[PDB]
Design a protein around this nucleic acid. Structure first.
Ligand SMILES: [Cl-]
Ligand SMILES: [Cl-]
Ligand SMILES: [Cl-]
Ligand SMILES: [Cl-]
Ligand SMILES: [K+]
Ligand SMILES: [Mg+2]
Ligand SMILES: [Mg+2]
Ligand SMILES: [Mg+2]
Ligand SMILES: [Mg+2]
Ligand SMILES: [Mg+2]
Ligand SMILES: [Mg+2]
Ligand SMILES: [Mg+2]
Ligand SMILES: [Mg+2]
Ligand SMILES: [Mg+2]
Ligand SMILES: [Mg+2]
Ligand SMILES: [Mg+2]
Ligand SMILES: [Mg+2]
Ligand SMILES: [Mg+2]
Ligand SMILES: [Mg+2]
Ligand SMILES: [Mg+2]
Ligand SMILES: [Mg+2]
Ligand SMILES: [Mg+2]
Ligand SMILES: [Mg+2]
Ligand SMILES: [Mg+2]
Ligand code: NA
Ligand code: NA
Ligand code: NA
Ligand code: NA
Ligand code: NA
Ligand code: NA
Ligand code: NA
Ligand code: NA
Ligand code: NA
Ligand code: NA
Ligand code: NA
Lengths: 237, 56, 92, 194
RNA sequence: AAACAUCUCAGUAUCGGGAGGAACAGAAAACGCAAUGUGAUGUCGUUAGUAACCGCGAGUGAACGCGAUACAGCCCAAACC
RNA sequence: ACUCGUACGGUCACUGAAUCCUGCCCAGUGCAGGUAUCUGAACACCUCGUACAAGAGGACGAAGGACCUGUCAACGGCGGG
RNA sequence: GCUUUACUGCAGGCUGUCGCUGAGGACUCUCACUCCGGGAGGAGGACACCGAUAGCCGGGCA
C-alpha cells in the first residue's frame, strides 16, 4: 500500500507545518537574577495567532519589552511583578511556593525555569492544592494531580479568552480560517472513505472498517489508526 | 482542461539554461544545478557507468 | 492385535532357535552433535533457512510394527520387518 | 632492565584495572565533550605509538577519533527483495571501526598520510582510536631513513586503499598459508569472496 | 532450479572513496607429496571439475605440489648507550 | 514535524445541520486491566558429561498466553422450535 | 495492484539479559550518564538513553 496520512505528516512538509513565520511570540516567564524587583507596565493587549486568545504587551523596568501570556482581567496601565516577593494579584508571576493554596493559576512551569508549560490555553487554569518544602501539588485542567517542585514559577489567575469553545463555528468557512493559523491539514477525509491501498479502513463495497477499530499500543505507524489503546469505547456502562 | 494542447500554452517559464561549466543547455536556473555535468552540485563532473553498455 | 511377550524363533547371532523376548523400540535421545545439527546452526541466517525452514511432515492412518527381538541366552537383539498394526499388545 | 615504556604497555593490558582504570573514567568525560577528530600533542599510549612507528619529530602528528559502536546504520529496502536480503538489524559492515577512524582522521588532514593506529578504549557508545599521521612533504621526514618510504608518490591515500596496518589485517591478509586463498594478493582480484 | 523460500544469476549490474604507469602482493607464528623434505610474492600451465559445499536438488568449487616466467632481500620497536 | 503550541490543547477514528430519538448481546474477534495457579527465551546459577568443549538435565521466570473482569457511538449480531 | 487467522521472512512496539556501570528480593547514596538553569545550582540516577542479544506481537512492509 501507500503511507497513510499520519505518516505523511511527520515529514514536516509545508502542508503540515504551522505558519510559524506568522506567529508573534513564544510566551515564556522572564528570567530574574533574584530579588523579585522586576516589575513592568501593560502597554498593550494583542491577539495571539498561535492561540486565538489575547496577549499582553509589557514594558519592564530594565527596558525589556516582551509579550506575555495574559490572565483574564489585565488591562492597559496595570502593573505586573515577577519574583519571589511579587505581590499576590492577577497577572503576577512567582513560584508556587510563595503562592497561597486555593488560588487559580496558569502558565505553570513543569520544572523551575522552563518558562511555563501547563494551563495556558483560552480560559483555563491550574489549581494549587498542597504545599510543602519538597512538593507543590497542582491540579491541571485535565483534572490530573501533578506533583511539582515548589520552585516552579506560575502566573496568577485564569488564562484570558474564556468561553471560546462555547460558540459553534456554524460553517466550514470558519473552521477553514481557524485551521489556516495552525499546523494542521484541514479538511479530513474519513479512512473508510479511502481505498484499500490508502488506509487500513479503506476498500469494501460499502463503508465500514475491515477489522475492529481498537488497536494495540504496539501496532506500528501506518497501521495505528482507529481507537488507540482504548481502555473502552461507547458510552454504555 | 486538456492535459494535451491547452495545457501547453502556459509554458513560458525558464528552467534549463546554457551551463557556465559544460556549455550544455542544462543549467537549471531555479535549482542552480546542471543536469548534465552536475555544476552547482558536484566539484567532480557528473558521470555514470550506465551511460554506456555494461562491458563498454 | 495381540503378540506373545516371549517365544522360540531363529536367532541370527547364535545361529539357532531359542527363546526371544519382544519389546517395542524405545526412541533414543539425540546428542545434538551430529553433522545435520552443525549444518542447521551454520546454514541458518537472515530470511528463510531453506530445508531448516520446513516443519513436521504428518501421519499415516496406521504405523508398522517397530519391535526388538532379544535372544534369551546370548542377550543379543535383531530387527525384523514391521507390519501395519493399529495396535499391538503383548500377552504377558 | 624493564624500559619505562614497558610499564605503560603493562597498564594497558587491563585498562579496566588499577590507575589507568581511573584515568579513563576521568578523560572519557572530556573526550565525550570533544569533536570527532581532535589533534593531540602527545600519544596517550607512548609505547604503543613508538612501537607503531611514532617519533617525537617534526611532521609527525597524532589524533584521537570517536566513532559510534555497534553494527551497520543501514536503511531498509524500498523495493523488491528476497527474504535472505530483507535484512537490516543484523547487517554489519565489512570494514572494522578502527579502520573508519583511520579514515575520518585522514580526511581531516588532507596533506597527511596514515602511518598506523591504535585503540584507546571505548564507553557504551563511542570507540576511540588515536591515529598516527605523517607529513610526507616535510623534510626531516623526507630526510629520515625510517619514514621517508611514506613520502613516495605510490603511497598517496594509503588508508583509502587499505594499505594501512588495520587495513591489511581486516583484508584477511594475515596468514600466508591456508585460509588466504581468496585473500591474497587482493580481494578484488579474487572475485571478492573473502 | 522447468513453481518457489535456502541455493542460483553474483559479489555480477549499478553506487561511494581513491592510487599508479601500472596497481595490488611480498621475505613464513608458512607448507605438512610427514619428510634426513620445500623455502618471499605475483602471474602462466597443470594439479581438477579433484578435495570441499549444496531443499545433498539445480548448481558451486579451491589449495599443497609440480613444470615455467622473473628473481632480492631488508628497516624499526626494545634491551645496552 | 506537530510547536512562537500545553487539555477551552492536538493527535487518532466513526457519524454527518436542525428536530424527536438512538433498545437488547461481552459468547467469538479486537482493545484495556487484573491474575493464586499453569505456560513462558536467553544470560548468570546448580547437576551430569568432557583434564577443556560440544551436549543432556535442573532451579529461577519477564513481556505474552491460559484464566477473570471491563468494554458495542469496538468488529459485528438481534434466529429455529 | 489489493486482502487475509495462506507460506516464509522484514521493520516497529513490548519484555528478560549483557555492556556503558559507580558506593553502602527489597533499599539508600552519588561519581558516570540524562534533563532543567545564563550561572550558581536544581531534578533524575546507576535507571534512562545508546550498543548487543533473547522471547512475544507483528499485511506497516517484502
Ligand atoms: Cl479547531
Ligand atoms: Cl510395536
Ligand atoms: Cl592515507
Ligand atoms: Cl613440500
Ligand atoms: K531470486
Ligand atoms: Mg514556544
Ligand atoms: Mg468540537
Ligand atoms: Mg458565521
Ligand atoms: Mg496550514
Ligand atoms: Mg471527513
Ligand atoms: Mg472510492
Ligand atoms: Mg493495507
Ligand atoms: Mg455509511
Ligand atoms: Mg459505516
Ligand atoms: Mg498527464
Ligand atoms: Mg532466518
Ligand atoms: Mg593482480
Ligand atoms: Mg525457477
Ligand atoms: Mg526440484
Ligand atoms: Mg559461488
Ligand atoms: Mg595447501
Ligand atoms: Mg465530526
Ligand atoms: Mg536541552
Ligand atoms: Mg503482500
Ligand atoms: Na473497508
Ligand atoms: Na559458515
Ligand atoms: Na590525507
Ligand atoms: Na569468504
Ligand atoms: Na522454469
Ligand atoms: Na511464477
Ligand atoms: Na542449498
Ligand atoms: Na613430486
Ligand atoms: Na463479545
Ligand atoms: Na469481549
Ligand atoms: Na495490478
Amino acid at each position: 500500500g501507500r503511507r497513510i496520512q499520519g505518516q505523511r505528516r511527520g515529514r514536516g512538509t509545508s502542508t503540515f507545518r504551522a505558519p510559524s513565520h506568522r506567529y508573534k511570540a513564544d510566551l515564556e516567564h522572564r528570567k530574574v537574577e533574584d530579588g523579585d524587583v522586576i516589575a513592568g507596565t501593560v502597554v498593550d493587549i494583542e491577539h495571539d495567532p498561535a492561540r486565538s486568545a489575547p496577549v499582553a504587551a509589557v514594558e519592564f523596568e530594565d527596558g525589556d519589552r516582551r509579550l506575555i501570556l495574559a490572565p483574564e482581567g489585565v488591562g492597559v496601565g496595570d502593573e505586573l511583578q515577577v519574583g519571589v516577593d511579587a505581590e499576590i494579584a492577577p497577572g503576577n508571576t512567582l513560584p508556587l511556593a510563595e503562592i497561597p493554596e486555593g488560588v487559580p493559576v496558569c502558565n505553570v512551569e513543569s520544572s523551575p525555569g522552563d518558562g511555563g508549560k501547563f494551563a495556558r490555553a483560552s480560559g483555563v487554569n491550574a489549581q494549587l492544592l498542597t504545599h510543602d518544602r519538597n512538593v507543590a501539588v497542582v491540579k491541571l485542567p485535565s483534572g490530573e494531580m501533578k506533583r511539582l517542585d515548589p520552585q516552579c514559577r506560575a502566573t496568577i489567575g485564569v488564562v484570558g479568552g474564556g468561553g471560546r469553545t462555547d460558540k459553534p463555528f456554524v460553517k466550514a468557512g470558519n473552521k477553514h480560517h481557524k485551521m489556516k493559523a495552525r499546523g494542521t491539514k484541514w479538511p479530513n477525509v474519513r479512512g473508510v472513505a479511502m481505498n484499500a491501498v490508502d488506509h487500513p479502513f479503506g476498500g469494501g463495497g460499502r463503508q465500514h472498517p475491515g477489522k475492529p477499530k481498537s488497536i494495540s499500543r504496539n501496532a506500528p505507524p501506518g497501521r495505528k489508526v482507529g481507537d488507540i489503546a482504548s481502555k473502552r469505547t461507547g458510552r454504555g456502562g | 482542461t486538456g492535459a494535451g494542447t491547452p495545457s501547453q500554452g502556459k509554458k513560458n517559464t525558464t528552467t534549463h539554461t546554457k551551463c557556465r561549466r559544460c556549455g550544455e543547455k542544462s543549467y537549471h536556473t531555479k535549482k542552480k544545478v546542471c543536469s548534465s555535468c552536475g555544476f552547482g552540485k558536484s566539484a567532480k563532473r557528473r558521470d555514470y557507468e550506465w551511460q554506456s553498455k555494461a562491458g563498454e | 492385535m495381540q503378540m506373545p511377550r516371549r517365544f522360540n524363533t531363529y536367532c541370527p547371532h547364535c545361529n539357532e532357535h531359542q527363546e526371544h523376548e519382544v519389546e517395542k523400540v524405545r526412541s533414543g535421545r539425540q546428542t545434538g552433535m551430529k553433522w545435520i545439527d552443525r549444518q542447521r546452526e551454520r546454514n541458518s541466517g537472515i530470511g528463510n533457512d531453506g530445508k531448516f525452514s520446513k516443519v513436521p511432515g504428518g501421519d499415516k492412518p496406521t504405523k508398522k510394527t517397530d519391535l526388538k527381538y532379544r535372544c534369551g541366552e546370548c542377550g543379543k537383539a535383531h530387527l525384523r520387518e514391521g507390519w501395519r498394526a493399529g495396535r499391538l499388545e503383548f500377552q504377558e | 632492565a624493564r624500559s619505562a615504556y614497558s610499564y605503560i604497555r603493562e597498564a594497558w593490558k587491563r585498562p579496566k584495572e588499577g590507575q589507568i582504570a581511573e584515568l579513563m573514567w576521568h578523560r572519557m568525560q572530556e573526550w565525550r565533550n570533544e569533536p570527532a577528530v581532535v589533534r593531540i600533542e602527545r600519544p596517550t599510549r607512548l609505547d604503543r605509538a613508538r612501537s607503531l612507528g611514532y617519533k617525537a619529530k617534526q611532521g609527525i602528528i597524532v589524533v584521537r577519533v570517536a566513532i559510534r559502536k555497534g553494527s551497520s546504520r543501514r536503511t531498509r529496502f524500498n523495493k523488491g527483495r528476497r527474504s535472505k536480503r530483507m535484512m537490516v538489524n543484523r547487517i554489519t559492515r565489512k570494514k572494522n571501526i578502527q579502520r573508519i577512524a583511520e579514515e575520518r582522521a585522514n580526511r581531516k588532514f588532507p596533506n597527511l598520510r596514515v602511518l598506523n593506529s591504535y585503540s584507546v578504549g571505548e564507553d557504551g557508545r563511542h570507540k576511540w582510536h588515536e591515529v598516527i599521521l605523517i607529513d610526507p612533504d616535510h623534510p626531516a621526514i623526507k630526510s629520515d631513513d625510517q619514514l621517508s618510504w611514506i613520502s613516495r608518490t605510490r603511497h598517496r591515500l594509503r588508508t583509502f586503499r587499505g594499505l594501512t596496518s588495520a587495513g591489511r589485517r581486516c583484508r584477511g591478509l594475515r596468514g600466508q598459508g591456508k585460509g588466504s586463498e581468496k585473500v591474497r594478493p587482493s580481494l578484488r582480484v579474487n572475485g571478492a569472496k573473502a
